[PDB]
Design a protein around this motif. Sequence first.
Motif, PDB file in Angstrom:
ATOM      1  N   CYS A  54       0.849  -1.181   0.000  1.00 35.61           N
ATOM      2  CA  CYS A  54       0.000   0.000   0.000  1.00 35.61           C
ATOM      3  C   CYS A  54       0.889   1.237   0.000  1.00 35.61           C
ATOM      4  O   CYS A  54       2.085   1.144   0.319  1.00 35.61           O
ATOM      5  N   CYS A  74      -2.062  -4.303   6.881  1.00 35.37           N
ATOM      6  CA  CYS A  74      -2.113  -4.880   5.537  1.00 35.37           C
ATOM      7  C   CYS A  74      -1.920  -6.390   5.590  1.00 35.37           C
ATOM      8  O   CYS A  74      -2.546  -7.138   4.821  1.00 35.37           O
ATOM      9  N   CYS A 107      -7.049   1.178  -6.645  1.00 36.44           N
ATOM     10  CA  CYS A 107      -7.711   1.516  -5.397  1.00 36.44           C
ATOM     11  C   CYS A 107      -8.704   2.645  -5.629  1.00 36.44           C
ATOM     12  O   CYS A 107      -8.342   3.709  -6.138  1.00 36.44           O
ATOM     13  N   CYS A 121      -4.669  -4.454  -3.526  1.00 34.34           N
ATOM     14  CA  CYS A 121      -5.974  -4.051  -3.026  1.00 34.34           C
ATOM     15  C   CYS A 121      -6.714  -5.249  -2.458  1.00 34.34           C
ATOM     16  O   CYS A 121      -6.500  -6.390  -2.877  1.00 34.34           O
ATOM     17  N   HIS A 134      -6.912  -0.193  -1.125  1.00 33.87           N
ATOM     18  CA  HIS A 134      -5.821  -0.581  -0.242  1.00 33.87           C
ATOM     19  C   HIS A 134      -6.354  -0.771   1.168  1.00 33.87           C
ATOM     20  O   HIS A 134      -7.324  -0.127   1.576  1.00 33.87           O
TER      21      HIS A 134
END
Length: 185
Positions: A54, A74, A107, A121, A134
């Motif tokens: 990201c 993430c 995104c 994503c 993201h």
Amino acid sequence: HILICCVCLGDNSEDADEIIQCDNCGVTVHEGCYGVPWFCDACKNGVSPSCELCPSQDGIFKETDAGRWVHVVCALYVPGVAFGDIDKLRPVTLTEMNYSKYGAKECSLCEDTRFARTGVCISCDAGMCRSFFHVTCAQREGLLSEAAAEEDIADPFFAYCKQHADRFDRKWKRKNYLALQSYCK
Ligand SMILES: [Mg+2]
Ligand SMILES: [Zn+2]
Ligand SMILES: [Zn+2]
Ligand SMILES: [Zn+2]
Ligand SMILES: [Zn+2]
Ligand SMILES: [Zn+2]
């Protein structure tokens, strides 16, 4: 005094799981959300890292097997990441499958157009909705959720686009995300 965990956006700092703060960069996180004078892992290596997944440079990071960095958040939400590694005190492992996803989607929530096609994503988890963003962009909009233990969902981490999100949950998560910048150095 109410600190906020930059991983789950919660604010409860009880006895077992306290919200600790990096003495170098000021990032704040639950012990239980990070695998735990204290330094976060990035500051222990003297880096201000970027995430492989990201474009955000805020939040808290863990090192990958190949010597790179990803957000804890993430790692929790990108499919195919064994995120229990940090609990076991071992690096995030990214697979060929993960690596082949970089830049595959755009995104829809990116503040900066230049980065909409970077990293990986995730999508909305309602029905068959195909809205992509993201993980940290969704986090900023209050869209990331974790099911409670009693809900008995095998993968408790899910995300909804703005059209499908719980409005109450979005509201306090967006508020707590905004308050995070106040605690930084
Ligand atoms: Mg998952
Ligand atoms: Zn937390
Ligand atoms: Zn730090
Ligand atoms: Zn990230
Ligand atoms: Zn984005
Ligand atoms: Zn949706």
